[PDB]
Design a protein around this ligand. Structure first.
Ligand SMILES: Nc1ncnc2c1ncn2[C@@H]1O[C@H](COP(=O)(O)OP(=O)(O)O)[C@@H](O)[C@H]1O
Ligand SMILES: Nc1ncnc2c1ncn2[C@@H]1O[C@H](COP(=O)(O)OP(=O)(O)O)[C@@H](O)[C@H]1O
Ligand code: SF4
Ligand SMILES: [Mg+2]
Ligand SMILES: [Mg+2]
Lengths: 268, 268
């Protein structure tokens, strides 16, 4: 069966960058990949297709919320190097639960057996809250990965996401793999946090010109025109993908009481 | 009764900064003020009390979720110049609806008539999603204020918050006041968005070193050592408070489709 990953973190921290470049890396390693955007900011798969594909909510609206009329070709799109792409989108105005479209997406994935017949599945998920449809990927994932920077807000979110994932531990198989420290020069604060919680930093991606430009060219680092700066960034994504494919030794971390994050990071 | 304001926006954009300084401004203008933090990052009222006060979830836990047993003295705290402070906190992550504690907090406020016997109430609310308990303050607010900057993510969040507020406006008295452009030199993108949507910029707060420092020092701008910028910043918070108190003309904005925000801001 597929190895399934769920990527969480605060808004704007690099979830889609990390997910898309990981999907591209896995494809380069010879794996069949499916990436599912689970975020009301519906550009998860943008750099894989070079476009904003029709979203699950778009196509649901088109069949007047009779999802039984949909076929995979309506909402699953081929992107870079054969990476398959689904984009949930966000719920329309007034919608009760903010996760509803992610819930509808995960329903369709299971009904169409789309987690089968592939090697790697990556869910790219809003993590400012983890509940309802935003928690649905956890029922399917083997490993959860948190994207973080060194700032207070991203670490505080990471701590809450750790708690959310561990709260599922008796019901789901998903376990935490660790974090990707992203868009920062070094990792002092992330490492301080990891030491306190026995958590693991899986990778460090600096704030790279190559990456910012890739999004502006509507491409992944791997689809980009070759230059030197691209090569180093590519290598770290390949390394990270290799480690996740191979599997890591387990961690058994803990979340801190939320109050104690303020203390730990000098913000009380 | 009290004039009730609800402040929404993406995580880390300046909601608690705007709320706390607005509360301090109203207090200086001679108004009785209640600020309610409605955010899992539970430092909304930190700079008013100079400390992380006990949260509603703290005290709910202690009484084993029998809110019956609580009195206002258990969860309402005195801060700067008599500004009164409540801090919701968040629920244990991964166990239920992320909005649960905000929902319980709103119930407690109504139970104890805490909206009825003050002049100004300010809810400071997570707005990366607007659903469940996070939408509950909109059932009591007179005016909703969105904090934003010129960046894509905060404007995109503001767009979705507009739609959420207007959905509540069908069944509740709340209307949109407009946005506070925060931590930016100018308001070019914010104004482009406002022009397209018939929204309104109510105020603009530049990125000020004194504001960032104030959070570290655990106080509001109104207690910061004086200088040209700090005086201007105070004056702007006063002007905003004055405008909200006297009231502005009713506006009738429209949110855009998410896809159209990518187009408008050049991110597709
Ligand atoms: N390591 C990095 N170096 C440079 N830019 C980055 C990096 N990670 C993310 N970005 C940029 O930051 C912005 C937000 O990243 P994104 O992956 O879309 O965040 P999220 O999916 O968590 O909201 C994008 O413009 C993206 O290109
Ligand atoms: N106008 C501003 N100038 C300088 N710093 C600001 C400004 N607004 C907010 N900040 C800083 O940004 C950080 C996050 O602000 P905060 O109000 O806590 O955001 P939110 O409540 O939206 O999560 C804080 O460290 C705060 O001091
Ligand atoms: S479960 Fe989560 S996403 Fe759904 S209403 Fe509650 S806070 Fe919103
Ligand atoms: Mg994203
Ligand atoms: Mg806040």
């Amino acid at each position: 069966g597929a190895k399934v990953f769920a990527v969480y973190g605060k808004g704007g921290i690099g979830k889609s960058t990390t997910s898309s470049n990981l999907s591209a890396a896995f494809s380069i390693l010879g794996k069949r990949v499916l990436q599912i955007g689970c975020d009301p900011k519906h550009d998860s798969t943008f750099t894989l297709t070079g476009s904003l594909v029709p979203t699950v909510i778009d196509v649901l609206k088109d069949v007047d919320f009779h999802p039984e009329e949909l076929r995979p070709e309506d909402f699953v799109f081929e992107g870079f190097n054969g990476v398959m792409c689904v984009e949930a989108g966000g719920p329309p105005a007034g919608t009760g639960c903010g996760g509803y479209v992610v819930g509808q997406t995960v329903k369709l994935l299971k009904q169409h057996h789309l987690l089968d017949d592939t090697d790697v599945v990556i869910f790219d998920v809003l993590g400012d809250v983890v509940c309802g449809g935003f928690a649905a990927p956890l029922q399917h994932a083997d490993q959860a990965v948190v994207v973080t920077a060194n700032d207070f807000d991203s670490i505080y979110a990471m701590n809450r996401i750790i708690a959310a994932v561990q709260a599922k531990s008796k019901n789901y198989k998903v376990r935490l793999a660790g974090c990707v420290a992203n868009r920062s020069r070094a990792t002092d604060e992330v490492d301080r946090f990891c030491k306190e919680t026995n958590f693991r930093r899986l990778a460090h991606m600096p704030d790279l010109d190559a990456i910012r430009r890739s999004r502006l060219k509507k491409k992944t680092l791997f689809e980009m025109d070759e230059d030197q700066d691209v090569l180093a960034a590519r290598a770290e994504y390949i390394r990270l993908a290799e480690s996740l494919w191979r599997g890591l030794d387990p961690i058994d971390p803990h979340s801190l009481p939320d109050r104690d994050i303020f203390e730990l990071l000098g913000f009380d």
